[PDB]
Write a protein that binds this ligand. Sequence first.
Ligand SMILES: [Mg+2]
Ligand SMILES: [Zn+2]
Lengths: 98, 529, 209, 79, 48, 48, 196, 144, 49
Amino acid sequence: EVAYCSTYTHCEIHPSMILGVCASIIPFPDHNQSPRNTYQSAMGKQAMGVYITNFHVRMDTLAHVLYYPQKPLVTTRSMEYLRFRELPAGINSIVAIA
Amino acid sequence: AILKPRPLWTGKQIFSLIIPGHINCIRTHSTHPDDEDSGPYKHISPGDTKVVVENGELIMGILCKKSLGTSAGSLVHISYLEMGHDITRLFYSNIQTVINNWLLIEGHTIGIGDSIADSKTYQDIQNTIKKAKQDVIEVIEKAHNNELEPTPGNTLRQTFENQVNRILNDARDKTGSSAQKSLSEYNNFKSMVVSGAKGSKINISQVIAVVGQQNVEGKRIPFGFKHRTLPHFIKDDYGPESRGFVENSYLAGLTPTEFFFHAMGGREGLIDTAVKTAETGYIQRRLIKSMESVMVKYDATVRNSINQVVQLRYGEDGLAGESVEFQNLATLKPSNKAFEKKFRFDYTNERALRRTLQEDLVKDVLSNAHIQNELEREFERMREDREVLRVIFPTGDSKVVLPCNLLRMIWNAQKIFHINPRLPSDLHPIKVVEGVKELSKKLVIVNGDDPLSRQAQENATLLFNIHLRSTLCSRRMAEEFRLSGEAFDWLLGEIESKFNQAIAHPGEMVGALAAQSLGEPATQMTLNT
Amino acid sequence: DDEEETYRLWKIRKTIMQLCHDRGYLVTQDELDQTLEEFKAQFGDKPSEGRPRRTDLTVLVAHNDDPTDQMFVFFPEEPKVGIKTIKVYCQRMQEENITRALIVVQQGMTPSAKQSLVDMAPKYILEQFLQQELLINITEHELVPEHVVMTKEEVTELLARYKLRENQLPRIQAGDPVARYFGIKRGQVVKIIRPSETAGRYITYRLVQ
Amino acid sequence: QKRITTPYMTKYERARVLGTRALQIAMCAPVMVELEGETDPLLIAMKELKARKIPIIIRRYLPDGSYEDWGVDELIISD
Amino acid sequence: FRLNLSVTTPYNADFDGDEMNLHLPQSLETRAEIQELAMVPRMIVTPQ
Amino acid sequence: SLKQRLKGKEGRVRGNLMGKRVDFSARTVITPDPNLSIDQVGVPRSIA
Amino acid sequence: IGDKFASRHGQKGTCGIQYRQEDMPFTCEGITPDIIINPHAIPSRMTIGHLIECLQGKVSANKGEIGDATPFNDAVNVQKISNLLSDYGYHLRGNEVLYNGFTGRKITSQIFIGPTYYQRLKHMVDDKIHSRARGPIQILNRQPMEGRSRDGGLRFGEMERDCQIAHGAAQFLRERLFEASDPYQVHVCNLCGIMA
Amino acid sequence: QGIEQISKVYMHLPQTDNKKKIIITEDGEFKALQEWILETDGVSLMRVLSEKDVDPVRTTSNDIVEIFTVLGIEAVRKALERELYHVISFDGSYVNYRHLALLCDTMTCRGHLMAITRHGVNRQDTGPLMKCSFEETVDVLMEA
Amino acid sequence: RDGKLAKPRQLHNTLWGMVCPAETPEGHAVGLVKNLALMAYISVGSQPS
Ligand SMILES: [Mg+2]
Ligand SMILES: [Zn+2]
C-alpha cells in the first residue's frame, strides 16, 4: 500500500508474550491503569490455593490449602501452559457493585 | 412543603432539622456558572445553586464538599465556631446516619453504561484526533526543509518540541470538551466528580476519550535503542505514535507498543513514591528537634529553653491560630470618590439621613453641631487609616486573616432582634462613635499603663482596629445595617468576649506545633518538579 | 576612560552624604540631591589628568548636638594602602584634633595595615570601607527594614520594663553591612521597625555583640 | 498587688486542677457541694468547679524568678 | 477495631488491612488530662 | 566495650532512655461501623 | 470479618460485616450476591478491566463456554459482548433490578451485578491481634520483655514523644515512659550527690 | 562585557501581578503595569546592583547567603520568609503565618544563619545532658 | 538497595520482550529485581573454534 516500511526482516509470533508469569493471569490487562497491573502481580503471589499435589507427605511449615478451588470463567490463552487449570487458587463469586 | 393532593416533604426540609442552633452561611456549589451572578436571576437559583443556610435552615442550594467538607468557612466550621464542640459532634453523627439510611432507599452504583458515549460523540472525537495527527506531520516535514527559526534562549529542537506539546495539549482539551458535554444526568461518574467524594475530571477523559501522553524524566519517551524507541519503528522518526501519545482510551483497550509506554510512565510514579517517603521521615523529624524548646511564657513572650527571647508577642500579634478567619478590610481598595461616598456620613443632603434615621435624632444632631464636628473628625481618622493601609499592603489584596468574623456577627444580630430593614428605625449616630471608642479601649494584649508599653499595645491591635472602625463606620451602619439600640449592646458585648478568649494560652509548646506544621507541606510537595 | 570615572565619584559621594546624615551629622540640604552635571561643574569635568584628584573630594562634618566632635573621610590614591600612608592621615588627624575618621579604600588594603588600625583603640577610631560597597545605598533596599540606634538611657528602660537582662536579647554581630553603615560598637542596642500582616507594625531589638 | 498575669484559667491549669481534686475525693476527702446520687470521683470534681468551690491555690512562676498565687475562686473559668 | 469514617481523614487511614495501636491511661490525673485536652471532639479545627 | 555499649542507635541512650517498649497496648485491624459516634471506638471482648 | 480478599485487578480489601441470606438484596428470581463492593473504588484508579470480566463472565455462565481474555485480541469489543447478552433475556449492560432485603421495596437505581474471580490472601486476623498488661520483664534492665503468650509491648518511639509534647500532656508523657516502663527507687545522700 | 559570575540572562514581561509593577494611580486605584525583566544563571549581586539602568531598590536573589553577604540579617529573615512561602504555595496549599515567622525567627535569632542541621544546632552550648543524646556522648561527658 | 539514583531503576526501551514490564515489587527494591518474559531464553555458551 502506501505503507510505513517495505523491508521488514522479521515478524512477531504473538505480542502477548511480553508479559511475565504472574502478570499473564490478568484478564484484559490492556484496559487498566498501569500501576494497577503492578500491584496484582505482586499480590497473586500470596493467594491461598493448593500449592502441590503431594501435600500429604510434605511436612512443610506454614502451609495453607483451600477446600474448593475453581478455575476461572474468563481465561487468558497463556494459562494452559503454566497449569492454572489444574492447581487453581480462587473461586468465582457473584459480585454486586452497590 | 406540599399539603393538598398528597403530603410530601422535601430533602432540604428534612436536612434543615440536622443543622443545629441558628447559624448563618452562604456558599456555592461546583457547577455554579460564572456568568450567572452578574445579570438577572441572582437570587433565584435556576440550577438551584448558591447555598444559603439562613437562621438555621437550608433555604436553597445543592450541597457538596464545598459546603460540608474540609475548607474554611464551611457549615461544619461555622457550627464549630458558634455553637461549640459537643454540638458539632452530634452534627457529624446525624448527617451520616440519616443520609446512609436514605441511601439504601435511593441506592448507587457504577456500571459501564456509566462509562460509554453515543456514536455522534465518538465520531466527532475521532475526526479531531485525525486532524491533530496530520498537523504534527506538517510540522515534522518543514523542520527537515529548514524553515524554522529558533527563539532566543531556544535551539531548533526545543522550539519544535514546545510547539508539539502545545498541539497535544490543545487536542486533549478538545477531546475533554467533546466528552464532558456528552455526560448525562443519571450518570454516576459525573455524580461522583461533582459531589467531591472521589474522582477528578481527567479520569473521565482517560476512561472515555484519550489516556494522554506519557513521559519519563520530564520529557517525551526517549530513544532507548539507537534512533528508535522499540524495534518496530523506523530510525530518525519523530511522530506522535512513535514516542508515546496514547490515542485510545481505557475502554477501547491499548495496542502493545502503547501498553509498554503506559507501563513506563506508571513505573516512574511508583519509584517517586518510595523515594519521597524516605525523605519525609528525616527533614521534618530533624526540624522538630531543633525548634522543640520554644514556648509561650507567662509574660506572653515566646522564649527558648535558655530563656533567651525569640519573639516578644506570639505570631507578632499575640493570638492562637485556632480561632481566626478570613476577612476583608474594604478601605484600601476603592477610589477616592467612592470612599467619600460610602464612609463620609455627610449630613449636607438632609434627606438621605432623614430616610435612614429617626427624624428627631437627625434634627438634634444637626442643631448640636458638636455632633457634626465629631463625625467629620471620625471621617478624617478613617482617611488616615486608609493611607496607613495603602502602605502595609503595597500590592492591592484585601484577604486578611483576623479574629471574629464581623459581617457574620452583624448578620446574626439582625435576626436575634428581628431587624426590619424596611423602616428608618433609630441609632443615635454619636452612641456608635462613643462605643467604638470604649470597646477599643477595653481589649488589652500588652497589659501596661507605662508610655513605653502603651506604644507596644497601640502597635499590636492596629490592623484589627483599622478593620473594626472600617466596618464600624457610622454611615455604613445607619444605612445598610439599620440596628436597634438593644442590638448594639449585644453586638459590642460579644466582640469583646471573642477577642478576650482568642488570646494565645500561656504554656502551649509552640515550637513543636510549628515544626510539625512546617513538616506538613514538606511532605505533600513534589519530589522533582 | 573618565566618563565612567566621573560618574562613580559623584555616586560614591552622594552615598556618603547620606551615611553621615544618618549618623546624626549636619549636612546641608542641597548636598544630598547634588545632580551629576552640578558635580561635574564644581569639582571638575574629569579626574583622568583632571582637577578631581581623589583629593579635593574629602569631607569634614560636625555633629548636630555638638560642634566639637567632627568626622573626616579620606579617599586614598593608591589601589592598595600601605603603612605610613594611614599614618600620613593619623598625622592629619593629630594636627586638626579630630578622632572620627573614615577611609574610602580604592581596591584593597594590606595585612600589615590591618594590624596598624586595630592598635589605636582609645583614640583615633577609623573605619575602613571599600569603593565598591559605597556605590549603592543598601538602606533603601526593599528587604532591609528601618534601624534606629537607642541612647544608653533608653536601653535601661527596656531591661527594666520587660524585666530582662542584656544577655537575653537577640544578637547581631558587628560585621554585617548595616552594623557598619551605622558605626556600631559592641554593647549597643539597635531598634528595628518593620510592618507585618497580622498586627500592622512590630518593633524588635538587637544586641550588637 | 502587681499582678501582671491573665485573669483567665488557662487550658492546662483546668486539666490539672480537675485531676488532682478528683484524686483527693477518691481517698475520702470531704466534698464541698450537695451532690445528688453522684458516685464518679471525676464527675463530682467537675461540678465543684462549676460552683467555684475547689480549695486549691495556683502558683504561677514568672520567668524572672518571681511568682504570684491565684485562688481558683478568683479566676474566670475558660469553658 | 471499629471507628467512624469521619475520623479516617486525620489518621490517613483506609480499611484494607491497616493496624492501629491503642494505649490505655492508668492513673486518674492522666485520664482527666486526656479528657480535658485531647478528645476527638476538641480537635475538629486545626491550628496549622 | 563500654563505648560500644553506650554508643548510638540501639545503645543505652538512643535505645533505652528515649525510645522504650511500653506495656498496656493492643493493636487490632480496623473495619467500619457507621453506627458509632465520632467520640467512640468499638473494642472486641477478648482485648477488653 | 477481618480477613483480606482481593480481585485480579489490584483491589484488596478486608471484610466489613456478614449478612444472612434473608437480608441481602435479591433479584426478581432469588439470586443474592456473595460479595458487595463499593462503587467508589472504580473512578479514582480506573480499573475498567474489572468491569468487563464480570460482563463477559455473565455470558459464559449462560452459554456454557469459557470466555477469552487474551490482551491484544481486537476481536472482542464491548459491543460484541453486549449484543450477545441481550439474547439470553438480560439488560445489555449487566444492570438488574434489585429488591431491598429488609423491607422488600424496589431500589430506585439498577445495580450492576455479575460473576467475578476472587482470591483469598494470606493475611488473616487471627494472627495479628495481641495485647500486653503487666507482663514478664527482663532481668538486667527490667524492661518489658516478650513472654510465652507471644505478646510483648508496643514501642513508644521518638515521633510519639513529640505529639504528646505539642499536646501539652505532661502527666501522660511521664506515665508512658517511667511508670509503665521500669519504675525504680534509689537512695541519695544530701551533702554529696552519691547513692547511699 | 558583563559580569563574570552571570552566565545567561533572559528577558520577559509578566502576566500575573506578582511580577508586574503595581502603581496607585491619580484617582487612587491599584494599576498593574507589564515590565521586561532579566533573570540570570549565576549570581553576583554587588556588581549588578552597582550598574546603571538597574533598579537598586527591588533587586532580589534567591541565594540567602549572598543576601546575608550584601544586605544584612533582617533581609535574610524577610527573604527567607518569602522563600518558604514561595515553595509552600506553589501546589495551592496554605500554611498559617505564625509557623513561618517562628521558624524564620528562630533560624536567624543569634545573629548568623543557624542552619537546621548537625552543625547549626550542635553549636548551641546547652547543658551537658542534652548534647550526649546527640552523637558525641562520652566526649561531652568528659569535657563537662 | 537504597541508592536514590533513578537511572538504574527506570524502565528502559531495550527490555521489550525479554523482561516483564509490569511485574516488580514496591518499597525500597523498586526496579532492582525483575522477572523475565515467557519466551525469553538465556544462552549457555560454546567454543569459537
Ligand atoms: Mg491502606
Ligand atoms: Zn555523702
